[PDB]
Amino acid sequence: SKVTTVVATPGQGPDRPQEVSYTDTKVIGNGSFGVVYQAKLCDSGELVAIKKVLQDKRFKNRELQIMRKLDHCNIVRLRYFFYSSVYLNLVLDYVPETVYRVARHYSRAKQTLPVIYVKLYMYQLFRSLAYIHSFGICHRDIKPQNLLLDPDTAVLKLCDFGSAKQLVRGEPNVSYICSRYYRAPELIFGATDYTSSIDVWSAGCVLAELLLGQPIFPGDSGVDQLVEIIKVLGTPTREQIREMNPNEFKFPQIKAHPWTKVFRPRTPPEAIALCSRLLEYTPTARLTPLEACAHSFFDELRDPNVKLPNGRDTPALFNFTTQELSSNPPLATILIPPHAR
Ligand SMILES: COc1ccc(-n2cnc3ccc(-c4n[nH]c(=S)o4)cc32)cc1
Ligand SMILES: Cc1cccc(C#N)c1
Numbered sequence: 001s002k003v004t005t006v007v008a009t010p011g012q013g014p015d016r017p018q019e020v021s022y023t024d025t026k027v028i029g030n031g032s033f034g035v036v037y038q039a040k041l042c043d044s045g046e047l048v049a050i051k052k053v054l055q056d057k058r059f060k061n062r063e064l065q066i067m068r069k070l071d072h073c074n075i076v077r078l079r080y081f082f083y084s085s086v087y088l089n090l091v092l093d094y095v096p097e098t099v100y101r102v103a104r105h106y107s108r109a110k111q112t113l114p115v116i117y118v119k120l121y122m123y124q125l126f127r128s129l130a131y132i133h134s135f136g137i138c139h140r141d142i143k144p145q146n147l148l149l150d151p152d153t154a155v156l157k158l159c160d161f162g163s164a165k166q167l168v169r170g171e172p173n174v175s176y177i178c179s180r181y182y183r184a185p186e187l188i189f190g191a192t193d194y195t196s197s198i199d200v201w202s203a204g205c206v207l208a209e210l211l212l213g214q215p216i217f218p219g220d221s222g223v224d225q226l227v228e229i230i231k232v233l234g235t236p237t238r239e240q241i242r243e244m245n246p247n248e249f250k251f252p253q254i255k256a257h258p259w260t261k262v263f264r265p266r267t268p269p270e271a272i273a274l275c276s277r278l279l280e281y282t283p284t285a286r287l288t289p290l291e292a293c294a295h296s297f298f299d300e301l302r303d304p305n306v307k308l309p310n311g312r313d314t315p316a317l318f319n320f321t322t323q324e325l326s327s328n329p330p331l332a333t334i335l336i337p338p339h340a341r
Pocket of ligand 1: 092
């Protein structure tokens with residue numbers, strides 16, 4: 001197998017290029033995100049992923065800019081970046097599995113993903129959002145394919161930052177963004193000036209999907225997506241519109257569908273309770289990521305005796321930086337339990 005030696009800049013150092021040799025290069029994804037490869041680093045033995053994303057020659061990549069600004073255990077780490085045939089190559093932590101494949105295995109086996117795995121996976125998604133959100137970075141593509149899992153350690157790493165943007169207060173962004181099923185209604189309603197909270201809607205969609213075993217708003221066109229969200233939440237008050245986008249569309253007033261009525265009869269109430277505080281027609285209603293962590297739902301994860309279904313200890317959950325504890329710093333007592341402090 002070809003040993004490839006590139007010249008690569010570290011992610012977190014100064015711009016200080018190294019010869020980096022990798023091998024066992026296979027391609028494991030190839031799509032709208034470009035090409036993702038698997039590789040083994042020759043000297044460490046460590047597995048890595050390598051996203052090869054299109055670059056002009058003199059057009060400034062935003063993903064890379066953002067990529068080096070981040071160091072969170074629930075975000076996939078940019079180990080190196082380098083160039084080839086011009087293409088930007090991002091050498092990443094390898095993470096074997098995605099929530100999308102996991103969710104589907106269950107779905108296909110007419111089985112629901114154990115609520116505890118929903119607790120962990122959501123928790124780490126919500127921490128990672130509380131992370132990138134403190135920097136005002138909206139991921140803008142939160143969907144099951146974009147949360148990577150290690151199934152053995154239960155670690156979730158949020159990935160693919162190819163749509164993330166440093167959201168500027170008072171500035172216009174595209175409204176046709178995110179994957180249809182996960183796209184907030186403001187986005188649907190052509191809003192060009194949206195908060196980072198669209199992520200948190202997207203996340204609520206992931207959570208509800210994990211509980212329902214199917215997407216919750218599976219529309220079969222951009223327009224139809226509204227029809228799916230109404231089926232559940234109801235017609236948004238014209239007020240609720242004002243609070244989504246000021247300005248379109250034409251709709252009659254369909255009734256809301258109660259929250260307990262949406263989820264299969266045995267779902268924990270703290271789970272349903274949460275969605276209601278995520279899937280809000282109102283962005284300013286959607287809980288901040290950091291608030292979402294403090295939620296009753298993730299209290300089993302605040303148990304000192306908590307274990308994985310394979311006997312093991314949970315991954316890092318309480319290593320909050322003060323950078324992270326900045327949306328609402330008075331949340332440590334009900335975020336950091338009395339054992340990791
Ligand atoms: C076919 O299923 C899989 C394909 C690839 C991966 N994969 C493994 N380690 C990874 C690290 C980073 C990324 C990634 N970040 N942004 C984009 S786009 O891809 C993907 C990774 C997992 C499962
Ligand atoms: C966007 C995305 C997520 C997860 C895996 C891949 C690949 N290959 C791409």
